[PDB]
Amino acid sequence: DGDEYFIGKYKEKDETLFFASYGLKRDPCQIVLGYKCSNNQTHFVLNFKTNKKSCISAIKLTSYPKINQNSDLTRNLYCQTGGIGTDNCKLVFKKRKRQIAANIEIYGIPAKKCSFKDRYIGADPLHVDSYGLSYQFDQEHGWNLERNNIFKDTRFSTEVFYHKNGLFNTQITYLAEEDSFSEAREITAKDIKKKFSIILPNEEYKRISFLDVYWFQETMRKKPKYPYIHYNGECSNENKTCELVFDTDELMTYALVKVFTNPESDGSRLKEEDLGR
Amino acid sequence: CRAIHCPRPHDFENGEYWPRSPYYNVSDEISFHCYDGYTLRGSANRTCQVNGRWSGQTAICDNGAGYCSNPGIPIGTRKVGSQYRLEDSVTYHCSRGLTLRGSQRRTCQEGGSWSGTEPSCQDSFMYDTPQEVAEAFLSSLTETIKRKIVLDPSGSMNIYLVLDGSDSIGASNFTG
Ligand SMILES: *[C@@H]1O[C@H](CO)[C@@H](O[C@@H]2O[C@H](CO)[C@@H](O[C@@H]3O[C@H](CO)[C@@H](O)[C@H](O)[C@@H]3O)[C@H](O)[C@H]2NC(C)=O)[C@H](O)[C@H]1NC(C)=O
Numbered sequence: 015d016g017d018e019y020f021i022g023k024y025k026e027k028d029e030t031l032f033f034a035s036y037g038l039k040r041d042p043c044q045i046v047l048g049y050k051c052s053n054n055q056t057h058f059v060l061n062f063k064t065n066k067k068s069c070i071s072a073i074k075l076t077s078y079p080k081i082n083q084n085s086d087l088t089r090n091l092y093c094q095t096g097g098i099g100t101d102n103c104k105l106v107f108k109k110r111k112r113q114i115a116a117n118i119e120i121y122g123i124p125a126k127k128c129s130f131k132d133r134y135i136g137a138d139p140l141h142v143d144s145y146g147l148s149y150q151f152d153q154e155h156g157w158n159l160e161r162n163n164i165f166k167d168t169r170f171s172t173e174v175f176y177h178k179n180g181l182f183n184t185q186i187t188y189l190a191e192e193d194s195f196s197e198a199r200e201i202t203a204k205d206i207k208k209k210f211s212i213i214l215p216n217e218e219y220k221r222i223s224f225l226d227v228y229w230f231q232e233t234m235r236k237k238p239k240y241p242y243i244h245y246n247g248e249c250s251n252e253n254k255t256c257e258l259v260f261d262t263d264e265l266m267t268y269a270l271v272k273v274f275t276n277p278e279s280d281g282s283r284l285k286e287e288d289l290g291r
Numbered sequence: 292c293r294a295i296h297c298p299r300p301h302d303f304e305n306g307e308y309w310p311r312s313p314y315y316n317v318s319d320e321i322s323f324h325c326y327d328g329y330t331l332r333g334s335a336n337r338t339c340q341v342n343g344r345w346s347g348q349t350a351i352c353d354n355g356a357g358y359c360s361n362p363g364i365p366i367g368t369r370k371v372g373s374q375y376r377l378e379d380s381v382t383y384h385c386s387r388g389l390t391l392r393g394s395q396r397r398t399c400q401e402g403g404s405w406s407g408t409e410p411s412c413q414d415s416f417m418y419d420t421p422q423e424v425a426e427a428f429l430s431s432l433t434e435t436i437k438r439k440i441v442l443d444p445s446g447s448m449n450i451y452l453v454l455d456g457s458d459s460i461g462a463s464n465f466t467g
């Protein structure tokens with residue numbers, strides 16, 4: 015059977031960039047199609063850089079033989095310089111003592127008119143998020159809980175950072191029963207800087223009550239450095255156009271924001287033990 | 292008692308070495324260099340010292356079109372076999388007056404590595420000095436990280452020491 019690792023999401027109308035099979039004990043590799051690798055006792059890295067005009071969509075790796083360890087609580091595949099949307103990134107994989115083969119495939123789509131909003135937004139945005147796990151609330155306060163069966167990390171107290179299939183997450187605030195879905199906004203790779211911002215409307219019945227961000231990025235080492243996504247000034251009733259400002263320590267390659275709307279929100283909603291320094 | 296002669300190379304495939312002589316004295320040099328479109332791994336300049344062994348590693352010129360890589364010809368031996376795909380075998384043997392030390396047949400395993408050790412046949416008068424013996428024993432017995440021994444959970448080791456007391460030394464009662 016063998017274990018599998020994913021990056022991104024697959025679609026039924028994508029062509030293959032390349033497809034190969036590798037042994038995991040030879041030294042050095044076999045140079046396939048003039049590419050470069052590196053193999054050690056506990057690391058396997060690959061360099062990729064396409065020539066045609068295309069943007070990458072998904073990556074998948076399969077390993078044999080099966081080993082007794084789950085594949086969702088830690089990180090095993092990650093690429094260090096690039097990502098999803100940029101035409102190249104340098105894959106890194108961490109082995110064990112009992113893995114002796116690998117199969118690798120890459121899919122992509124034409125560069126000019128390629129956007130990923132049609133997949134990660136789902137078909138029922140009000141009930142299921144991009145991960146697939148459905149929302150579930152508390153009946154006495156109407157605030158969503160924290161999903162617990164995924165790789166989650168914290169920087170300091172009162173912070174959360176989930177990870178799954180190369181996709182991160184960060185929830186700005188708490189969510190109520192009677193919220194509605196307004197729209198979604200996407201940011202491609204040609205409008206990404208070390209620091210930038212985005213404008214959203216707050217006119218009458220388009221009051222912002224919930225924001226959750228999904229983004230890919232790069233990591234120099236296995237320990238990531240999550241960027242600072244703070245909320246510029248204060249978005250109260252008076253100031254109609256509200257801005258969201260990013261502050262990154264490493265360069266991203268894609269972002270997605272799912273605005274939620276609720277006319278009843280007063281602008282402040284916080285837990286009874288989150289509040290004091 | 293006569294002078295010490297370092298062994299003369301027997302075969303070399305896809306390459307050329309300078310210079311050539313019927314026998315090599317102490318502190319003589321050999322340089323390897325191989326054809327166009329290949330790649331050389333190892334040491335390009337090799338010299339033999341008073342011990343009787345060439346200094347460095349084995350020089351291997353490879354192309355890069357096989358499931359498992361080229362094993363190479365150790366200096367002094369001869370190789371039979373030229374198939375480098377899955378489930379093939381390669382055999383070694385060296386010249387007259389030399390006795391082999393290592394694997395006789397090597398087989399390309401599933402992962403991509405050979406099965407055995409690289410042979411290098413010795414003669415009567417080469418001994419091993421304590422430094423290399425200690426280094427090899429430590430490197431084989433433990434693993435690196437410093438150097439620590441690795442065991443599986445609920446694991447254990449059993450050491451069995453076997454000596455002999457036949458009439459070879461006769462030194463008191465196993466002294467030393
Ligand atoms: C086996 O190879 C892998 C890579 O194929 C090695 O991992 C990489 O090792 C390099 C060299 O130490 C690391 O680069 C170093 O990073 C520091 C961070 O500040 C920087 O100052 C330099 O760029 C320095 O060269 C690299 O981070 C590391 N990891 C990667 C590339 O993901 C691995 O160490 C090798 N195995 C052994 C036993 O050395």
Ligand SMILES: *[C@@H]1O[C@H](CO)[C@@H](O)[C@H](O)[C@H]1NC(C)=O
Binds near residue numbers: 248253255256
């Ligand atoms: C809130 O209004 C103030 C008024 O000066 C403005 O400076 C600020 O940018 C506004 N904040 C947002 C998030 O719109």
